[PDB]
Structure 1
Amino acid sequence: ALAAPPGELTLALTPDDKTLDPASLDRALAILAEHGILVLTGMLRTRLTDQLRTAMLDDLPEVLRQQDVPTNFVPGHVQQDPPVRESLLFPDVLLNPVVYQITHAVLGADARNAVYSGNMNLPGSHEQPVHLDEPHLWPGISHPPYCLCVDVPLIDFTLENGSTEYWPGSHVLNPDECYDERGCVLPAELERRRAVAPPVRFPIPVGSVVIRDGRLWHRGVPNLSAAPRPLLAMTHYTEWFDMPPIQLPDTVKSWVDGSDRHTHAHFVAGDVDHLTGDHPFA
């Protein structure tokens, strides 16, 4: 019911900021440890978010033409990969120096991005169940994080247009028989948790970047606006967690492969089909 992101969760920047001073970084880490979600305002320029927003709304028709449209949990929550064309792969988005500074500190210098995907929340979408995007490695065990979701809204997220319900501090909870095979939280454990630390939902301005634990409870909620709500989604993992590589064109290999901000990527000659992944050599 907030009119902006809570201060407990938020850290304000300009796009020119390339690192956090030690005091800011310790705070960012302290938030991800305690709350499991960190909102970074003013990270990305309009020039980038605009091109990416345009590119994904242009692709949405090709996505909805598909015989079976891939959704997450309920109708209206479409899985859509953004394009991997030389011209729409920006270093400030894939290899953001502030994001990787936080993820290196949390997951290790060998941590790597292994997801370049998206969530198109359509008008009249349904309520998702509360869930983990990425599960705990064993039931009934406390362990540190092995993955951080990096969510990039491509329009102003509002209460009406489907800003995500987040459950702060839920990333460290992992009792027995808590999660089912799709990673949905059992209803008993929700109501116990709602009493101690209830969910929050808030606007997130475009140009913001949200970093959160992969294990954080959350649910997508109905888009009641007249416009699709695109989200570009990356996920950094520890070196040792097994993931299939991101299909990228060799036209970007030059700067992506060199970097000490690691991507788990496989480079193909020529164009890559993000949408349906039909490209001949995977």
Structure 2
Amino acid sequence: ALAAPPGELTLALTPDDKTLDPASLDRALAILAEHGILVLTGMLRTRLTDQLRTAMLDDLPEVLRQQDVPTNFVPGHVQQDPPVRESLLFPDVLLNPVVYQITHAVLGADARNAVYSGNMNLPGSHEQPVHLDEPHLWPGISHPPYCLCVDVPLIDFTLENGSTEYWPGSHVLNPDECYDERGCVLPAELERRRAVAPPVRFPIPVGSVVIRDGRLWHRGVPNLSAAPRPLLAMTHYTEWFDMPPIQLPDTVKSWVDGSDRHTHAHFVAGDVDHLTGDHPFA
């Protein structure tokens, strides 16, 4: 049982750090290339994580009221987008200078965030199948990354409350007949991999940011605590990967648009309904 993020995957920062020195950036990139997952501790202030946690636990009842509750693979892994009210859209979350320094270095200067989503892992949730969030672009081909997932826990993640299982080094594996249509890893390839590089699961304190290859094998696991475990998710993509834009209110256009940290965004004159997208001119 691991008690903290492993040294091999971890870089420790303060919220005041606005760029990595060249040696830290080199280490960040070497970790993403070799392991496909990088844990950055001490990035986000309590003031932001408190407001986002509160907003998502306040919204959970509206999500559970829906006729079909949207879930990822298995019961208890609920799909919940964080709010896109002006008051809960934070430059240090959407446009984090350290996150974009890393994604610029891996994906290029034209890399863009195209995801503002979340994962609410409920008490008593089931085991997800091992999967990738974004696939390899062709079967049986080694190619570099085209996307980096940026995962922001909104409480302390523990072994008990459903810290995500990650498969280090799995992001480069793409043999023939390795994935099904849903992005789940075939059992034969899981067992081959398990024997060479088994998965890891570790606590991640709130304030941390996880950056990983969008193709990294991982799974949500049971939340065996008394409280829902909220996770905020973003994903940076190369410029040339087709994605629907994030719906944002035009109140944040001034600072989101024309930043050197790109967002694939559509700016809406009214209020955006993050929970159902049933707002006018959706």
TM-score normalised by length of structure 2: 1.00
Residues in 2 aligned to 1:272 and 1:220: alpha-carbon distance in whole angstroms: 28
Residues in 2 aligned to 1:73 and 1:259: alpha-carbon distance in whole angstroms: 36
Residues in 1 aligned to 2:58 and 2:26: alpha-carbon distance in whole angstroms: 40
> C-alpha displacement at 1:152, in angstroms?
0.1
**For residues 48-59 of structure 1, what are the structure 2 equivalents within 5 Å?**
48-59=48-59
**Partner of 1:85 in structure 2?**
85
**Partner of 1:150 in structure 2?**
150
In the alignment, structure 2 segments of 5+ residues that lack a partner are none
Residues in 1 aligned to 2:134 and 2:226: alpha-carbon distance in whole angstroms: 31
The superposition leaves residues 163-203 of structure 1 with CA deviations (integer Å, 9 ceiling, x where unpaired) of 00000000000000000000000000000000000000000
Name the SS for the 2:256 alignment partner: helix
Aligned-residue CA RMSD in angstroms?
0.4
Residues in 2 aligned to 1:252 and 1:258: alpha-carbon distance in whole angstroms: 11
Residues in 1 aligned to 2:190 and 2:247: alpha-carbon distance in whole angstroms: 37
Name the SS for the 1:83 alignment partner: coil
The superposition leaves residues 209-252 of structure 1 with CA deviations (integer Å, 9 ceiling, x where unpaired) of 00000000001000000000000000000000000000000000
Name the SS for the 1:258 alignment partner: coil
Residues in 1 aligned to 2:89 and 2:29: alpha-carbon distance in whole angstroms: 28
Residues in 1 aligned to 2:111 and 2:135: alpha-carbon distance in whole angstroms: 18
Name the SS for the 2:92 alignment partner: helix
The superposition leaves residues 85-109 of structure 1 with CA deviations (integer Å, 9 ceiling, x where unpaired) of 0000000000000000000000000
User: Could you tell me the percent identity over the aligned residues?
Assistant: 100
**Partner of 2:215 in structure 1?**
215
Name the SS for the 2:257 alignment partner: helix
> C-alpha displacement at 1:258, in angstroms?
2.0
Name the SS for the 1:266 alignment partner: strand
**Partner of 2:257 in structure 1?**
257
Residues in 2 aligned to 1:193 and 1:108: alpha-carbon distance in whole angstroms: 30
Residues in 2 aligned to 1:267 and 1:279: alpha-carbon distance in whole angstroms: 13
**Partner of 2:114 in structure 1?**
114
In the alignment, structure 1 segments of 5+ residues that lack a partner are none
Residues in 2 aligned to 1:13 and 1:117: alpha-carbon distance in whole angstroms: 24
Name the SS for the 1:251 alignment partner: helix
The superposition leaves residues 32-57 of structure 1 with CA deviations (integer Å, 9 ceiling, x where unpaired) of 00000000000000000000000000
> C-alpha displacement at 1:136, in angstroms?
0.2
Residues in 2 aligned to 1:110 and 1:279: alpha-carbon distance in whole angstroms: 30
Structure 1 runs of 4+ aligned residues shifted over 3 Å read none
> C-alpha displacement at 1:80, in angstroms?
0.2
Residues in 2 aligned to 1:107 and 1:277: alpha-carbon distance in whole angstroms: 30
TM-score normalised by length of structure 1: 1.00
> C-alpha displacement at 1:129, in angstroms?
0.5
Name the SS for the 1:44 alignment partner: coil
Residues 1:133 and 2:126 aligned together: no
Equivalent residues, number: 282
> C-alpha displacement at 1:280, in angstroms?
1.6
Residues in 2 aligned to 1:175 and 1:200: alpha-carbon distance in whole angstroms: 22
**Partner of 2:201 in structure 1?**
201
> C-alpha displacement at 1:281, in angstroms?
1.2
Residues in 2 aligned to 1:23 and 1:82: alpha-carbon distance in whole angstroms: 34
The superposition leaves residues 98-146 of structure 1 with CA deviations (integer Å, 9 ceiling, x where unpaired) of 0000000000000000000000000000000000000000000000000
> C-alpha displacement at 1:29, in angstroms?
0.3
Residues in 2 aligned to 1:157 and 1:16: alpha-carbon distance in whole angstroms: 23
> C-alpha displacement at 1:279, in angstroms?
1.6
Residues in 1 aligned to 2:21 and 2:59: alpha-carbon distance in whole angstroms: 39
